[PDB]
Ligand SMILES: [Zn+2]
């Protein structure tokens with residue numbers, strides 16, 4: 001029986017949060033195994049695009065989950081709370097690792113990894129659910145622990161686990177807040193309880209573990225919010241998305257007006273025609289990306305007008321979705337297990353490279369991807 005892989009995402013855990021004395025369990029795991037200095041997210045540095053990149057090895061421009069909210073000429077609208085969109089395989093390009101696993105006869109069990117609610121290339125995981133808010137830390141940890149312990153024909157080669165709590169605290173209070181730190185501590189402790197349980201079940205010794213985050217988090221201080229309509233008025237273009245990566249589709253005949261107003265450098269953002277976006281972001285070729293894309297500067301938000309008003313103004317907040325090269329956007333990568341190196345540190349690297357490592361650990365043929373297999377070979381024990 002081959003070694004299982006446990007894949008854990010801590011949404012929005014910034015790379016530097018491992019060095020603050022608030023992650024005793026993860027820090028111990030890192031010391032036992034392999035730790036990268038940091039891992040860069042792909043553009044845009046948002047939750048759905050990057051979780052899906054992690055399990056496919058593809059940039060968002062290639063896998064088609066180009067933002068959390070999208071429009072498509074055939075499929076219509078996509079956003080996180082529209083279940084039949086999120087659950088429709090046609091949005092999701094490439095081949096996520098759970099599909100690869102199931103297609104070899106082996107099984108995958110997922111706790112709410114973006115994409116896992118769809119039948120991507122016709123293949124659901126053996127275990128999965130519709131994400132809902134406020135599930136307890138123990139509920140999910142005990143489920144994952146159960147799925148790792150299963151034998152016979154229900155044996156899982158891949159088990160995935162997701163935590164939203166750090167990300168949520170980051171948005172609400174910022175990355176330097178005591179609330180963000182408390183969330184980090186809580187998630188770390190829960191992972192500690194999972195690892196202890198795995199040892200008691202005798203699954204620890206035969207399970208490889210990868211812990212990642214999808215992106216970091218930057219502080220958004222009071223006064224750092226503008227209206228998307230400050231960028232372009234509604235008569236000349238529609239804001240398809242708000243937040244930090246702002247897509248505009250000019251109204252019919254308004255491309256020139258929209259461009260005259262929007263393109264170039266502004267106070268706290270820059271905008272480009274999608275085909276002209278900075279090449280280093282490897283983004284802008286996908287038809288689902290709006291015609292004009294604006295990138296807010298670090299620590300600034302642009303919101304739909306009705307949000308700006310009910311934005312109860314007072315305190316510090318957080319956001320991601322900024323330039324993936326920024327240290328604030330850096331994610332975590334660490335791993336430990338029987339097939340992985342011990343007491344090793346790796347250079348900073350790009351998140352598309354994780355897929356090739358996982359394919360090897362799962363015994364599946366690597367689907368075509370945007371990553372470099374060389375990068376994480378040093379993470380392997382041999
Ligand atoms: Zn996220």
Ligand SMILES: [Zn+2]
Pocket residue numbers: 012047167168171320
């Ligand atoms: Zn977030």
